[PDB]
Structures are given as C-alpha cells and as structure tokens.
Amino acid sequence: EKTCDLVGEKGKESEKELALLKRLTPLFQKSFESTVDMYSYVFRVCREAGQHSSGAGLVQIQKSNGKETVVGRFNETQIFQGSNWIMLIYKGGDEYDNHCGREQRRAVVMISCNRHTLADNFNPVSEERGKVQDCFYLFEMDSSLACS
Amino acid sequence: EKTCDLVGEKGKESEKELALLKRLTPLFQKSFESTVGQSPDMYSYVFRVCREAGQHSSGAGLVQIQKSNGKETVVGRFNETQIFQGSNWIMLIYKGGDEYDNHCGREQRRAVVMISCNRHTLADNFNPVSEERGKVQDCFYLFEMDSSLACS
Numbered sequence: 405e406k407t408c409d410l411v412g413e414k415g416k417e418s419e420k421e422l423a424l425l426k427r428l429t430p431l432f433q434k435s436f437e438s439t440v441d442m443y444s445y446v447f448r449v450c451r452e453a454g455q456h457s458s459g460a461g462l463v464q465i466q467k468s469n470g471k472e473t474v475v476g477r478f479n480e481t482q483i484f485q486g487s488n489w490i491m492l493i494y495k496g497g498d499e500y501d502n503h504c505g506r507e508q509r510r511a512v513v514m515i516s517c518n519r520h521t522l523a524d525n526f527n528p529v530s531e532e533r534g535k536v537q538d539c540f541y542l543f544e545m546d547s548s549l550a551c552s
Numbered sequence: 553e554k555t556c557d558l559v560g561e562k563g564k565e566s567e568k569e570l571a572l573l574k575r576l577t578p579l580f581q582k583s584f585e586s587t588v589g590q591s592p593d594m595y596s597y598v599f600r601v602c603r604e605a606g607q608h609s610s611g612a613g614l615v616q617i618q619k620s621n622g623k624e625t626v627v628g629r630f631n632e633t634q635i636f637q638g639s640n641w642i643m644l645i646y647k648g649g650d651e652y653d654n655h656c657g658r659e660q661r662r663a664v665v666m667i668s669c670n671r672h673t674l675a676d677n678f679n680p681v682s683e684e685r686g687k688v689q690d691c692f693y694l695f696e697m698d699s700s701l702a703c704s
C-alpha cells in the first residue's frame with residue numbers, strides 16, 4: 405500500500421502525523437488542479453500527481469510546452485494541524501538550477517476548514533524562490549476534513 | 553535595535569519576508585503569555601515578535617517557563633526567523649531553541665506560530681496548541697494567535 409512516507413523508520417512514525425494521513429484517506433482517490441499565468445498545478449494527497457512516474461505529490465505544468473516539473477514528492481511528507489486547518493508539505497521536488505542554492509523544490513499546502521465541501525478551491529498562492537535556502541511553492545485549498 | 557533575522561546575508565533576504573517583517577512592526581512592542589499543562593509539567597509560554605521574550609538576554613523569541621521552579625527553556629530564537637503569509641493567515645517560525653536531551657535526535661527546539669485573521673484585534677488569543685517531539689527530525693511546538701494584520 406504505497407502512500408505518503410513520513411520521517412522515521414516505517415512503522416515508527418509520529419502518531420500525530422499518521423492520524424492525519426488516516427483522516428485524509430478519503431481524498432487519496434481525488435485530483436486537484438489550479439484554476440485561471442504560464443503554469444498550471446496538479447495536486448494529490450499521497451498519490452502520483454504527475455504523468456511521468458516520478459513520485460510527485462504536486463506538479464507544475466508549463467502550459468506553452470507541457471513541461472512537468474515536480475514541486476514535491478509524497479515520499480517526503482510532513483503533515484500537522486491546528487484548530488481549523490491542516491498544513492501538508494511535500495519536500496524532494498526537482499532541484500532549482502539557479503535559485504535557492506539549487507535546493508530541491510518543496511510544496512506547502514494550507515488546507516482550511518470549509519463545512520460545504522469535502523475538498524475544493526485548490527490554487528497556488530505564490531512561489532518563494534528569492535531566498536538562499538528554505539524556498540517553497542505555497543498553495544491553499546478548502547476541506548471539511550480540516551474542520552475541528 | 554535587535555530584531556528578527558531572516559535567512560541570507562544582508563541584501564540577500566527574501567523581498568517577501570522583508571515586506572512581511574515591516575508589516576508586523578506594530579506587534580514588536582507587544583508580549584503574549586499563556587499557561588497550560590499540569591504539574592510537574594505546567595508551563596508558562598511567553599511569546600514576542602522580533603523581540604526578547606526571555607529574562608536572560610538569550611535572544612529568545614518564545615520561551616517555556618517551568619512553573620515549578622521558574623526555569624526558562626528557549627523554544628525559539630528570533631535571529632532564526634522565517635515568516636510567510638496566505639490569504640487570511642501568517643505563519644511565523646523561530647528555530648534555534650534549546651536542544652532536546654532525549655528527543656528528536658537532540659535537535660534545537662522550534663516554535664511555529666499560526667496567526668489567523670481577526671478584524672477585531674491587533675493581537676489576542678495566544679494559545680499553545682501542541683508539541684511534536686515524537687519524530688527523528690523536524691519537531692516543533694505549535695501555537696496559534698489572532699491578528700488583524702493577517703487579514704487581506
């Protein structure tokens with residue numbers, strides 16, 4: 405059962421994170437895509453979001469030439485929650501060539517509570533690529549699973 | 553004069569973070585506190601934005617005070633600040649806290665503060681949410697607070 409991989413040895417991961425992955429299980433089968441920029445974004449929870457078997461959890465597609473860039477891989481997942489929100493992070497994306505000390509890309513998704521939908525309104529917020537390190541692409545989406 | 557330090561040498565800091573830093577200025581003069589837990593683990597968490605929250609000039613941005621003896625533990629230092637915002641929230645992270653002795657591979661503590669929009673106050677409801685010390689890395693103390701500055 406291939407899915408999101410958390411830090412730590414298999415079967416010895418944080419119970420907090422494991423519980424959140426369980427809570428989001430109903431979203432695994434879904435696919436989320438941005439609406440509208442020269443790029444489109446596709447996001448999935450613990451499942452391949454790309455079309456190149458790269459293990460992507462979130463990909464960026466350049467519309468003009470179809471280039472698919474891996475923003476983050478689900479084999480490097482972090483997930484935590486607050487009152488009415490859940491933050492999901494996928495590290496290990498394709499490396500930058502000139503920005504951010506050439507570190508691997510990363511996806512940060514802020515899922516906010518919304519009692520009216522199981523999941524929707526996924527869209528990019530911005531890309532932070534102006535730092536020497538710890539850069540990231542930020543996204544937001546709504547989900548009733550984030551309510552609590 | 554000492555304030556939050558962002559990653560990167562002077563002139564190499566993120567334009568986004570620099571702008572956000574300036575936006576947070578009205579919060580610098582404030583101080584926040586919240587007591588939670590039960591002895592012998594009752595703590596008093598003191599948080600400040602880009603200013604010393606501790607009583608030992610350690611550059612702490614957020615401290616955990618052991619109520620049983622008043623001992624101060626640094627959760628995060630503001631010279632290791634990261635800040636970013638979304639549509640109706642702002643997340644502040646202070647790394648460089650005191651090292652754990654038995655958890656998280658002894659990495660330095662870290663404070664993560666989720667600031668949610670509230671048009672009724674400049675800042676209120678500072679609340680400790682939880683502590684994640686069960687991972688091999690990337691552990692952290694999580695807090696929440698309200699602020700009109702997080703409103704778009």
Ligand SMILES: O=P(O)(O)OC[C@H]1O[C@@H](O)[C@@H](O)[C@@H](O)[C@@H]1O
Binds near residue numbers: 464502503533
């Ligand atoms: O790889 P470099 O040269 O640093 O350029 C980085 C840029 O590449 C483009 O293809 C996109 O993925 C942008 O979102 C990214 O910021």
Ligand SMILES: O=P(O)(O)OC[C@H]1O[C@@H](O)[C@@H](O)[C@@H](O)[C@@H]1O
Binds near residue numbers: 616625653655683
């Ligand atoms: O330092 P160790 O032995 O790993 O114990 C870690 C614990 O210490 C206590 O004093 C508090 O700061 C707790 O929040 C922390 O989780």
Ligand SMILES: *[C@@H]1O[C@H](CO)[C@@H](O)[C@H](O)[C@H]1NC(C)=O
Binds near residue numbers: 459477479480496
């Ligand atoms: C994530 O997947 C990539 C692609 O195979 C792999 O190189 C990397 O080691 C994985 N990350 C971890 C933590 O194993």
Ligand SMILES: *[C@@H]1O[C@H](CO)[C@@H](O)[C@H](O)[C@H]1NC(C)=O
Binds near residue numbers: 611632
């Ligand atoms: C953060 O403060 C600590 C405390 O002295 C210091 O050692 C560290 O260098 C500071 N962070 C940076 C990047 O200067």
